[model samples]
Target: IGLTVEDLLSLRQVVSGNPEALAPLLENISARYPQLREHIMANPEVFVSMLLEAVGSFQVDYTPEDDQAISRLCELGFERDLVIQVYFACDKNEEAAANILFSD
Candidate 1:
């Protein structure tokens, strides 16, 4: 996938702040994904979430331990979505992720 997290991160950068300068990059991205074309401009937040999910699929480098950690976190009653986020952010450390989730 050409649209790596680096692309998404840059996408995030402009999305974080830019109205005029943002549209072209978005349109370029939309050109690559048909489903996103319609909503790209009209629904930026939608585009962003969908874009992140898109990148997430390609970005995952999960191992057995990573999957087990995510499952363990979910078993502790956290949202799977958030658990995955924290797991990745915490470098797949189950204990560290659990501590962060616990603190929350």
Candidate 2:
């Protein structure tokens, strides 16, 4: 929030390299919290990490069953954070999250 316009512009450029995966993550966040969409564009890490930290929040809780799914998806080249978020977003359904990952 302290960032100036030029700071945002530069940060956006830095974050832009991974937009393909980021797009879906942003969509999930936007779907849940419409207001966060705009600010996430300026500084994604802060909001996303905050979201991840909250219990029963966007990230959901990690259980023993998730290990295999997480490993398989990570093996397929998805970013760990993206996989975790989408897996929970998909209600911890591996196939569903994998489908979303495939779209990226």
Candidate 3:
């Protein structure tokens, strides 16, 4: 499905350090899929990309923040779970996961 203007605005909120502004969107998402919320919250970087993807924005390369988040998740042993699944699924056409896991 394509994004609405609201979704675009929500994306802006996320990028602008107002991810909490996406609460309504997140709540709706959680309502529909309860399992996704923890994954989203646990790995905020991947969650940002997922939100952007959902909003039809241009996909961003994984940033240092993204790498750090993934690294923390890995250190915490959450990497192989839902967080990785979300990251990989969002980055299916890119080497984002590999880059995050292996790059400096």
> Positional deviation of 21 in candidate 1, in angstroms?
28
Query: What C-alpha lDDT, on a 0 to 100 scale, does residue 14 get in candidate 3?
Result: 65
The predicted structure with the larger TM-score, 2 or 3, is 2
What does the lDDT come to for candidate 2? Answer: 0.60
User: Cα lDDT for residue 20, model 1?
Assistant: 50
Which residue pairs in candidate 2 collide?
Answer: none
Per-residue lDDT of model 1, residues 36-78, tens digit only: 5456567779665754565322221345766787898899999
For candidate 3, the per-residue lDDT at 31 reads 34
Q: CA lDDT of 58 in candidate 1? A: 28
Model 2 TM-score (2 dp) = 0.40
CA lDDT, every prediction? 0.64, 0.60, 0.51
Winner by TM-score between candidate 2 and candidate 1: 1
How many residue pairs clash per model?
0, 0, 0
In terms of TM-score, the best-performing candidate is: 1
Q: Give me the runs in candidate 3 sitting further than 4 Å from their true place.
A: 1-24, 53-104
Worst 10 residues of 2 by lDDT: 53-62
lDDT of 3 by residue, 1-104 (tens): 23346645656666566655465544433433445657767887876676566534433234466555556556644444445454544443134545544552
